[PDB]
Each structure stands twice: as structure tokens, then as C-alpha cells.
Amino acid sequence: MTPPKAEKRPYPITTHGDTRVDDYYWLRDDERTDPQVLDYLQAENAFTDAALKPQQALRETLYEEMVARENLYFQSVPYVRHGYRYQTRFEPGNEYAIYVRQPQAESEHWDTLIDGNQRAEQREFYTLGGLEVSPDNQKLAVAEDFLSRRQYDIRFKNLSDDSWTDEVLENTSGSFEWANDSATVYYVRKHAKTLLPYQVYRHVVGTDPQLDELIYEEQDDTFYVGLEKTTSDRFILIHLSSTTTSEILLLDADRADSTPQMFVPRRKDHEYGIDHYHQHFYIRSNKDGKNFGLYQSEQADEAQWQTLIAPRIEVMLEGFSLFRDWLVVEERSEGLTQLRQIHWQSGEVKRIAFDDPTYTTWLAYNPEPETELLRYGYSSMTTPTTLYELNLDSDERVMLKQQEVKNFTPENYRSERVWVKARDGVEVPVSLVYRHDSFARGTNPLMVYGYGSYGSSMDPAFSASRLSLLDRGFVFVLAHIRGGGELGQLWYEDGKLFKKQNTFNDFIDVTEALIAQGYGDAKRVFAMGGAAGGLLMGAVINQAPELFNGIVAQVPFVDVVTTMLDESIPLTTGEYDEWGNPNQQAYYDYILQYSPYDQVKAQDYPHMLVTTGLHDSQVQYWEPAKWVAKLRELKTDDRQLLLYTDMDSGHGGKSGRFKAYEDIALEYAFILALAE
Numbered sequence: 001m002t003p004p005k006a007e008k009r010p011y012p013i014t015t016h017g018d019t020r021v022d023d024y025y026w027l028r029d030d031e032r033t034d035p036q037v038l039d040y041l042q043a044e045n046a047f048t049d050a051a052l053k054p055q056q057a058l059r060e061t062l063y064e065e066m067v068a069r070e071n072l073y074f075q076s077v078p079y080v081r082h083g084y085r086y087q088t089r090f091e092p093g094n095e096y097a098i099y100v101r102q103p104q105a106e107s108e109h110w111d112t113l114i115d116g117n118q119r120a121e122q123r124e125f126y127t128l129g130g131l132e133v134s135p136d137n138q139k140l141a142v143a144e145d146f147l148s149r150r151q152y153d154i155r156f157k158n159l160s161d162d163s164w165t166d167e168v169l170e171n172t173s174g175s176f177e178w179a180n181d182s183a184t185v186y187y188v189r190k191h192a193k194t195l196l197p198y199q200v201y202r203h204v205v206g207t208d209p210q211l212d213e214l215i216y217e218e219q220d221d222t223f224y225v226g227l228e229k230t231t232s233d234r235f236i237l238i239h240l241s242s243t244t245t246s247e248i249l250l251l252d253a254d255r256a257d258s259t260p261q262m263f264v265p266r267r268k269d270h271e272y273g274i275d276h277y278h279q280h281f282y283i284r285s286n287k288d289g290k291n292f293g294l295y296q297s298e299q300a301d302e303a304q305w306q307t308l309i310a311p312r313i314e315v316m317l318e319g320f321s322l323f324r325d326w327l328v329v330e331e332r333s334e335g336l337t338q339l340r341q342i343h344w345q346s347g348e349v350k351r352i353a354f355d356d357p358t359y360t361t362w363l364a365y366n367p368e369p370e371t372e373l374l375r376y377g378y379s380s381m382t383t384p385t386t387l388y389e390l391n392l393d394s395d396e397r398v399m400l401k402q403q404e405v406k407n408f409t410p411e412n413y414r415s416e417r418v419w420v421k422a423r424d425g426v427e428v429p430v431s432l433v434y435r436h437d438s439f440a441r442g443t444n445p446l447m448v449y450g451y452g453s454y455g456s457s458m459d460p461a462f463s464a465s466r467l468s469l470l471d472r473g474f475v476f477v478l479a480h481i482r483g484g485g486e487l488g489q490l491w492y493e494d495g496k497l498f499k500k501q502n503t504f505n506d507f508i509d510v511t512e513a514l515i516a517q518g519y520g521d522a523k524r525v526f527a528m529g530g531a532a533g534g535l536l537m538g539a540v541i542n543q544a545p546e547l548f549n550g551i552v553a554q555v556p557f558v559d560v561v562t563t564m565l566d567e568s569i570p571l572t573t574g575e576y577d578e579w580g581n582p583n584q585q586a587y588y589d590y591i592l593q594y595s596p597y598d599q600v601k602a603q604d605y606p607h608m609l610v611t612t613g614l615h616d617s618q619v620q621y622w623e624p625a626k627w628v629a630k631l632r633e634l635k636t637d638d639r640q641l642l643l644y645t646d647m648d649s650g651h652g653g654k655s656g657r658f659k660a661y662e663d664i665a666l667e668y669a670f671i672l673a674l675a676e
Contacts, residue, residue, distance in 0.1 A: 001047065001050060001051065003047055003632055003641070004040065004043035004044050004046075004047055004632075005629075005632065006023075006024055006027065006040050006625075006629035006632075007026070007036070007040075008023035008024070008633075009023060009024075009025065009026045010022075010023055011023070011025030011026070013025075013562060013565070015561075015565060015582065015583075015588055016585045016588055018588070018592075020561070020562070020598065022562065022597075022626070023629070023630070023633070024622075024625070024626035024629045024630060025562075025626075027040060027622040027625045027626050027629070028620075028622040028626075029622070030568075032614055032615060032621075037622075037625075040625065040629070041614065041621070041625060041643075041645040041647075042647075044625070044628065044642075044643035044644075044645065045643075045644060045645055045647070047642065047643075048609075048642040048643060048644045051640060051642055052642070052666070052669070052670065054673075055666075055669040055670065055673050058669045058672060058673065059665045059666060059669045060665075062468050062664070062665040062668050062669055062672075063661055063662065063665040065407070065468060066464070066465050066468060066661050066664060066665065067658075067661055068406060068407065069405050069406045069407050069408060069464050069467065070404075070405075070406075070464060071404045071406075072090070072091075072092035073090070073091060073092060074088075074089070074090040075087060075088070075089050075090075076088040076089075077375075077387050077400045077401045079365060079367060079375075080104050080367075080368065081133075081367040081368065082133070082135060082137060083103065083104045083105075083137065084101045084102065084103060084104060084133070084137060085101060085102050085103075085104050085106070086099070086100070086101050086113075087099075087100050087101075087110070088100075094117050095116070095117060095120065095126075095655040095656075096115070096116025096117045096119070096120055096126060096128075096655055097116050097128070098112060098114075098115045098116065098117070099112070099113040099114045099115075099116075099131060100112055100113060101113050101133075111159075113131070113133075113140060113159075114128070114131065114140065114142055114157070116128055119144065123146045124146070124147075124148075124649075124650065125145065125146055125147060125148040125649075125650050125651075126144065126145070126146060126655075127144070127145040127148075127652075128142065128143070128144060129143040129144065129145055129152040129174030130142065130143030130152065130154070130174040130175070130176060131143075132176070132177075132178065133159065134178045134182030134183075135178055135180055135182050135233070136182035137159065138158065138159055138160060138182060139156055139157070139158065139159065139178075139182055139205060140156065140157040140159055141154060141155075141156055141176055141178065141185055142154065142155055142156075142157070143172060143174035143175075143176065145174075148615075148649055148650055149195075149617065150195065150617075150618070151170070151171050151172070151190060151195065152172045152173065152174035153168045153169065153170055153172070154168070154169035154172050154174075154176055154185070154187055154203075155167075155168050155169075156205050156206075165205060165206050167203075167205075167206070167207065167208055167209055168209070169187050169201070169203060169209055169212075170209075171189060171190050171192070172187050172188060172189060172190065173187075173188040173189075173190055173197040173225070173226070174188075175187070175188040175197070175225075175226045175227045176188070176227060177227045177228070177229045177236045177253075178229075179236065179253050179254075179255075179256065179258075180233060180253045180254050181256060183204060183205055183256075184202060184203070184204060184205075184256050185202075185203050185205065186200055186201070186202055186203075186215065186227050186236050186251060187200070187201050187203060187227070188200060188225050188226065188227055189201055194221070194570075195570075195617075196221060196224075196574075197218075197224060197225040197226065198217060198218045198221075198225055199214060199216070199217050199218075199225070200214075200215040200216040200217075200225065200227065200238055200260075201213065201214060201215060202215050215238075215251070215259070215260060216238050216249060216260050218240055220242070221573055221574075222242045222243075222573065222574055222576075222577075223240045223241060223242055223245075223247070223266075224239075224240070224241050224242075225238065225239075225240060226238075226239045226241075227239070229253065230253075230274075230275050230276035230277065231275050231276065231277040231322050231369050232275075232276040232277050232278075232279075233253055234252075234253060234254065234276050235250045235251060235252070235253055235276050236250075236251035236253050236258075237249070237250065237251070237274065238251065238260055239273065240266070241271065242574075242577065243454075243574070243577045243578065244268065244269050244271060244577055245266050245267070245268050245269065245270060245271065246266065246270065246271050246272045246273065247262075247263070247264070247265065247266040248263040248264070248272070248273070248274050249261060249262060249263065250263060250300075261300075262300065263281075263300045264300055264301075264302050269286075270285070270286065270287055271285070271286050271292075272284065272285035272286070272287070273285075275320075275322060277322045277369060278322075278344075279298075280296045280297065280298065281295075281296070281297040281298070281299075281300075282294065282295070282296060282308075282320065282322060283295040283296075283297060283305055284317060284319065284320060285305070286311070286489070287302065287305075288307075288310070288311055289310070289311020289312070289313075290311070290488075290489040290490060290493070291311045291312055291313065291315060291316045291317060291488050291489055291490075292311055292316065292317035292318075292489075293307060293308075293309055293310050293311040293317065294307075294308040294309040294317060294320060294327075294329065295307060295308060296308055308327070308342075309329065309342075313490075314333055314334075315331050315332070315333045315488075316331060316332040316333070316485070316487075316488030316489060317329060317330075317331055318330040318331060318332060318337075319363060320363075321363050321366050321374070322369050323366070323369050323370075323371060323372070323374070323392065324369060324370050324371065324372070325343060325344060325345070325372065325392065325393070326341045326342065326343060326344070326372070326374075326392045327341065327342045327343075327344065328340070328341045328363060328374055328392070329341075329342070330362060330363050332457075332485070332486070332487070332488055335417070335429040335480060335486050335487055336354075336359075337359075337360045337361045337362065337459060338351060338352065338361065339351070339352040339361055339363070339374075339376055340352070341374070341392050350392075350395065352376065352390065354378065356380040356382070356383065356415070357415055357416055357417040357431075358380055358381045358382075358415040358416070358417055358431040358432075358433065358460035358478075359378060359379065359380035359381075359383070359460060359461075360377075360378075360379055360380075360459035360460060360461050361376060361377065361378050362376065362377045363375075363376055363377075364376050364377045364387055372391055372392045372393045372394075373389050373390070373391060373392070374389065374390045374392055375387060375388070375389050375400070376388055376390065379403075379460075379461035379462045380415065380460060380461065380462060381413070381415040381431060381432075381433035381460050381461070381462065381463075381476075382410055382413050382414075382415050382433065382462070383410065383462060384402050384403035384404075384405050384408075384462045384464075385402070385403040385461065385462055386399055386401065386402050386403075387399070387400040387401040388400065403462060403464070405462075405464050405467070408464075408467060411436075412435055412436060412437065413433055413434065413435055413436065413470060414433070414434060414436050414439070415431065415432065415433040415460070416431075416432055417429060417430070417431060418430040418432065418513070418514070418517075418519075420506075420509055420510045420513040420514075421509075421513075422502075422505060422506050422509045423505055423509050424502075424505075426482070426494070426502075426506075428479070428480060428481060428482070428506045428509065428510055429480040429486055429487070430477055430478070430479060430480060430510050430513075430514070431460035431477070431478040431480065432475055432476065432477040432478070432514070432519060433460075433466070433470060433475075433476050434470060434474070434475040434476070435470045435471060435473070438473045439475070441518035441519075442518040442520075442521060442522075443473075443521055444473050444474065444475045444519070444520055444521060444524075445473060445474050445475070445520060445521060445524035445525075445526060445549075445675040446474070446475045446477060446511075446514060446515070446519060446520025446521070446524065446525045446526065447469055447474050447475070447476045447477065447526045447527070447528065447671070448477045448479055448507070448510065448511050448514070448525065448526065448527045448528075449476070449477065449478055449479065449527070449528050449529065449533075450478075450479040450481050450503075450507045450527070450529050450533055450536045451483075451484060451529060451530075451531075451532060451533040451536070452479075452481040452482065452483035452484050452495055452503035452506070452507070452532070452533065452536050453483050453484075453495075453496070453503070453532030453533070453535070453536075453578065454483075454492070454496075454532065454578060455483075455484065455485040455489065455491075455492035456484060456485060457480070457484050457485040457486045458478045458479075458480060458484060458486070459486070460478055463476075465661070465664050465668075468664075468668055469668060469671075469672075472672060472675075473675075474526075474675070475514075475519050475520055477510070477514060477519070479506065479507050479510040479511075481495060481502075481503050481506035481507050481510070481536075482494045482495030482499065482502040482503055482506050483495025483496055483500065483502070483503035483532075496578055496579075497577075497578070497579070497580050497587075497590075498580070498586075498590055500579065500590070500591075500594060501593070501594055503536060503539075504536060504539040504540050504543060504594060507527075507536055507540050508540060508543065508544045508547065511525060511527070511544075511547050511548075512547070515547075523549065524549050524674075524675050525547060525548050525549055526548065526549060526550045526551070526552075526671050526674070526675065527540065527548050527550075527551050527552075528551070528552040528553075528554070528667070528671075529552075529553065529554070529556075530553075530554030530555055530556070531554065531555050531556070531557060532557055532578075533554075534553040534554055534555060534556020534557055534558065534610075534624070535556060535557040535558065535560065535594075535596065537551050537552075537553035537556055537608075538553060538556055538557075538558040538596025538597070538627065539594045539596050539599070541596075541605055541606060541608070542596055542599040542600065542601060543599075545603055545604055545605050545606060546604070548606040549606060549607060549674055549675070550606050550607035550608065550609075550670070550671055550674040550675075551606045551607070551608040551609070552608070552609050552611070552667045552670065552671065553608060553609070553610045553611070553624065554611045554667075555611060555612050555613065555619050555624070556596070556610065556612075556623065556624050556627065557623065558595070558596040558597045558623050558624060558626075558627040559595070559597045559620075559622070559623040559626060559627070560579060560591055560594070560595035560596070560597070560598075561582050561588065561591050561592050561595045561598055562597070563620065563623065564576070564579050564580070564581070564582050564587075564591065565582050565583065569620060570617065570618055570620075571618065571620075579591055596627065597623070597626060597627050597630060600627070600630045600631055600634050600635075601634065602634045602635075602636055603634075603635070603636055604635070604636050604637035604639075605631060605635045605637055605639065605641070606639060607639045607640045607641075607670075607674050608631075608639075608640070608641055608642070609640075609642045609644065609666075609667060609670045610624045610627065610628055610641075610642065610643050610644070611624070611644050611645075611646070611663070611667075612624040612625065612643070612644075612645050612646070613645065613646035613648070614645055614646065614647050615647075615648065615649045616646075621645060624643065625643060625645070628641060628643040642670075644666070646663075
């Protein structure tokens with residue numbers, strides 16, 4: 001079958017006297033209306049449909065077995081907050097969650113707080129982006145998106161009679177806090193054009209939003225504006241943060257006329273976050289070390305901050321929770337997540353021990369500090385996600401919930417942590433899982449998954465959908481490459497800006513070691529990654545095409561120089577601290593060397609499926625479309641190259657989780673057919 005051939009319209013882009021001619025610059029159409037652009041995306045979708053037509057039966061088998069291992073009756077673990085018990089309920093044949101509550105001393109009767117199915121009646125789209133009852137338990141504030149544009153309407157329900165007030169706060173981030181009067185709420189307004197959060201307003205419930213007062217306006221575009229409330233309830237925080245740099249303003253939660261009080265003025269490369277409890281500020285801050293410390297203060301002044309935990313090169317400090325008698329910290333060390341608890345009085349330290357080679361642990365939702373019971377999450381490549389509750393004093397651990405997986409026997413699978421010595425001598429961790437009875441050294445197809453940007457960690461956890469590959473002989477690998485966070489801030493920093501190439505080198509060095517050690521069949525190595533992990537997919541296949549049989553590149557960031565030169569593209573002005581600004585000759589040069597679109601060569605490429613989405617305003621559909629067009633023009637092999645563009649507008653990843661399972665089934669069928 002003859003693949004679609006995009007029209008070439010040579011478009012020169014000249015930077016620092018370097019001219020790049022982009023034949024497909026025209027595929028970018030911000031209005032997503034141009035019929036010629038739509039024609040190319042439709043033709044590629046038709047080609048993908050026709051190429052993958054024989055995989056239909058396998059797609060059905062995969063889809064049905066993925067849905068079959070999940071319950072359709074889900075009920076959350078109930079939690080208590082301000083004398084009420086809260087539960088979320090999904091029943092089969094309901095797109096949306098029902099949220100219920102009852103008085104804490106009640107068992108029998110539950111009251112509906114909000115039914116998403118009911119709220120979605122006569123609407124094209126529904127996302128709940130926020131839910132919070134007032135301190136006096138009388139009012140519900142909800143942040144809802146009916147239009148799919150990530151702009152939230154805040155509305156108010158009287159819980160006494162289930163009546164709604166008739167005002168709406170429009171174009172909000174969904175971030176809002178009640179003042180302690182259960183009458184005033186603070187909310188974040190998004191910029192009209194950029195949709196970036198930039199204003200804090202104050203609303204009296206029951207009044208017209210025209211009466212609302214502007215409390216704070218952020219001048220720096222790169223600074224996210226979010227609202228928080230301290231554990232003590234004494235302060236509403238205006239949390240301002242770039243990727244590198246923080247600033248917190250305090251709002252007295254106990255007055256109706258409060259103005260923002262500076263905590264510590266922003267200083268480039270000083271990231272901090274605060275809470276308030278027991279008459280102290282608690283600060284997680286990188287002021288003295290990239291791996292962060294914890295500080296106590298009676299006042300804002302940075303020089304008064306007292307050190308509770310000093311930053312350590314070996315231990316990244318990720319977060320903390322405050323309880324009556326205990327401090328609990330989330331840390332990473334030697335490539336594992338950990339929890340430690342420290343007694344406020346005795347200074348007694350306990351670590352929460354797990355022996356699984358490939359697990360992750362985290363602080364879960366603990367809305368009440370007056371307790372000895374900690375809720376924390378656990379998952380491994382062999383153990384479905386678990387909520388535990390720990391008695392911090394007695395060390396008694398109970399299981400509150402497990403992820404229910406049907407047709408699944410945990411003993412059928414093995415997992416391992418492998419360390420690979422990268423080409424520059426740096427040790428890269430790897431987490432891998434496979435079915436015991438079908439494993440034979442050098443025989444198995446290998447799926448290598450990476451991300452490797454922003455300090456995001458691909459922490460090893462359980463996947464139900466992954467069983468569809470493991471039960472078909474695949475060794476599934478997480479490559480914990482530089483640019484991720486698995487070994488702390490230095491791990492991230494050694495895979496961004498002028499070290500970004502280490503991300504792609506680590507992925508190739510990991511893949512080569514695994515093949516050398518017989519984890520996979522050299523001829524049946526597959527890889528997948530999405531977004532900045534699609535950047536990884538693009539760079540790896542330019543640099544080392546021969547390693548991989550097949551590739552899935554989801555919504556890939558591939559036109560890196562051109563996108564990062566254009567502040568009109570959503571996200572660009574917030575990403576200079578990740579890739580660099582190619583307006584500077586040093587960054588242009590460094591970035592162009594890996595920018596996958598720019599490094600497409602007349603060479604043999606793996607089989608590849610590239611995905612994207614038309615109407616998702618923060619998915620830049622043109623980048624993978626241009627990339628596929630250029631690959632079609634230059635590649636020397638006869639292997640399959642497909643572009644699938646989601647033409648939808650709605651549902652996304654939840655409720656249309658069936659859409660999510662459909663995409664997984666398509667992608668896994670594509671790979672399984674190549675590995676057969």
C-alpha cells in the first residue's frame with residue numbers, strides 16, 4: 001500500500017545565520033480548521049486503519065482481557081475530615097464517580113455530595129477539577145469543566161437542602177480555599193489568552209462575581225499560582241513557583257479583609273514550600289543543598305530557619321506530613337523510595353522497611369494531624385497498589401485496600417533491580433518484570449519504557465494492562481535514565497539543559513546491557529515513551545536505529561529547536577529551564593544535535609507507531625505529523641511507519657478509560673504482531 005505523502009512547502013528558519021528548511025512547517029494550524037492539514041492527518045489515519053486491519057481480533061482479545069481483570073464496582077477507602085466520612089463510588093454503567101459522605105459517628109446512611117453523572121446530564125463534557133466542603137460543613141465548593149478546555153467553573157451547593165447558589169466563578173485553575181468563616185473563598189483566575197494561572201480573587205458566597213476583589217497578580221508568566229491551606233488552618237498560602245524558584249505569600253484565614261504577607265522573597269534556584277502547625281512554620285527548602293532540607297521557623301525570615309533535616313548528597317527529600325507526635329518524610333535513596341518518621345519530643349527515628357527489589361512507597365492522603373495513624377501507598381511490579389495504615393507509635397501496619405486484579409496470580413511473575421554501568425561510568429538503575437514459566441535467557445521479547453525529563457521518576461509500580469505483555473513472554477523494563485528523578489536532583493540535572501544527551505545515552509546503554517545479559521532476544525527489542533519520553537523515542541531511533549525491532553512514540557516532542565524558538569506555542573515560555581533557550585547560540589547548537597525532527601537521516605528505522613491528538617490544545621499535533629512526513633521522505637527501510645491522530649474532543653483517560661484501554665490495545669497489538 002502506498003503511504004500518504006504530505007505536500008512539501010519549503011519553509012526556511014534562520015537562527016544565528018543557520019538556515020533549516022522545514023518542508024512541513026505548514027502542518028501547524030493553531031485553529032485546527034485548515035482542510036489541507038486535516039486531509040494529511042485523515043489520510044495517515046486511513047493508512048494506519050488499513051495497515052492494522054489484520055490486528056483487529058488481537059485488539060479485541062487484548063481489550064476484553066484488560067477490562068476483565070478490573071472490577072467495575074469501585075469504592076474508595078473512606079477518610080474522615082472535620083467530623084464527616086467521605087467515599088467515592090463508581091457503579092457499572094456510570095461514566096462518573098458519585099461522592100458521598102456521612103457524619104463520622106454515623107454508619108448506616110450516606111448522603112450524596114455530588115453525582116458526576118447527574119452534573120454531566122445534557123453536557124458534551126464533564127471533568128470534576130476540585131471538591132471541598134466549608135469548615136462549618138454547610139457548603140460544597142466544586143470546580144467543574146463542561147467544555148474540555150481545562151478552564152474550571154466554581155459553583156456552591158448548600159448541603160442543608162441540596163440547593164445551589166446561582167453565581168459561577170469562570171476561567172479558574174480549580175485551585176480554591178475556604179477562609180475559616182465558611183463564607184469567603186480565594187480562587188485562582190487563568191490569563192484570557194495563555195490560560196496560565198496569574199490572579200488570586202476573593203469571593204463572598206451568594207454575591208455576584210463582579211463584587212470579587214483582586215488579592216494578588218503574578219507579574220512573571222513562568223510562575224505558577226496555586227492556593228493551599230496550612231494544617232493549622234491559620235493561613236491560606238499563595239504558592240508561586242517556576243520550575244526552579246518559589247515564593248509564598250500568607251493570607252490570614254481568620255479575617256475577611258486579609259492582604260498577602262511576604263514569606264521569603266523569590267531568589268532564582270531557591271525552591272521552598274511551607275506548612276504551619278504547633279505554632280511553627282515547617283519549610284522544605286533547597287537553600288543549602290540540591291537534595292533539600294527540612295526547617296522549622298517562628299517567622300518568615302530565612303536566617304531564623306532552624307535545621308530539622310540537613311540536605312544530604314545520598315538522600316533526596318521529596319515531601320513531609322505533620323502529625324501530633326511525629327514528622328513523616330518521603331525520601332529517595334540508592335534508587336528506592338522510603339518513608340522515615342521522627343518523634344517531635346524523643347527524636348526517635350523509624351524507617352518503613354520494604355524488601356521488594358522494585359517497589360515505590362509514598363505519603364497518601366492524611367487530612368487530620370491529630371492521630372498516630374499514617375496512611376501510605378505501596379506498589380511493586382509484582383504487588384498491586386495497596387493502601388496501608390501504620391500506627392506510628394506501635395508500628396502495627398494494616399492493609400486498608402488493594403487494587404483488585406482478576407485472572408492474576410502474583411507468584412507467576414519475578415522482578416529484579418539491575419544496575420547498568422553507562423558509557424561515562426555512571427551507574428543507571430533498571431527495574432524489570434517477567435512471567436517465570438515462559439522466561440528463557442536470550443529468548444524473550446523485551447519492552448523498554450523510558451521518560452527521563454523534568455525530574456519525574458518512572459518509579460516501579462504494578463500495572464494490570466502490563467500483564468497482557470508479560471503473559472505473552474515479554475520482559476518489561478523501566479529504564480531509570482538521567483533526566484528523571486530516581487537518584488535525586490543531581491540525576492535530573494545530569495539529564496537536562498547542556499546534559500540532555502545523557503538521557504538518550506542511558507536508554508541505549510541500558511538496552512545494550514540487557515541484551516548482553518540475555519534478558520531479551522536481540523532481534524525482538526521494543527521501546528515506548530510518551531511526550532518528553534517521545535523525545536527519548538525520537539533521539540534513540542536517530543542515534544541507534546538497529547537496536548530496536550519496533551517503537552511506540554506517544555504525542556512525541558520532536559520539533560524541539562523550532563518549538564523552543566516560538567513563544568506563541570503553548571508551554572514554550574515555561575520550558576526554557578528544561579531544554580534551554582535556542583535564542584542563545586550555545587543552546588541552539590546543543591539542542592539541534594538531538595532535536596529528533598532535525599536529525600532524521602537517510603537510514604533504516606525500526607517499525608514505529610506514532611500517536612497524537614488534534615483537539616487537545618496542549619498536545620502539539622503537528623510535531624509528530626511533520627516527523628512522520630519527513631521519515632517517509634528520508635528513511636531507507638520498508639518497515640511499517642504509522643501515524644494515528646485522535647480526532648475526538650472528549651472523555652480522555654477516565655470514564656473514557658475505555659478510550660484509554662482502546663489505545664493500549666492498539667499499541668500492544670502493533671508490538672505483539674511484530675514480536676509474534
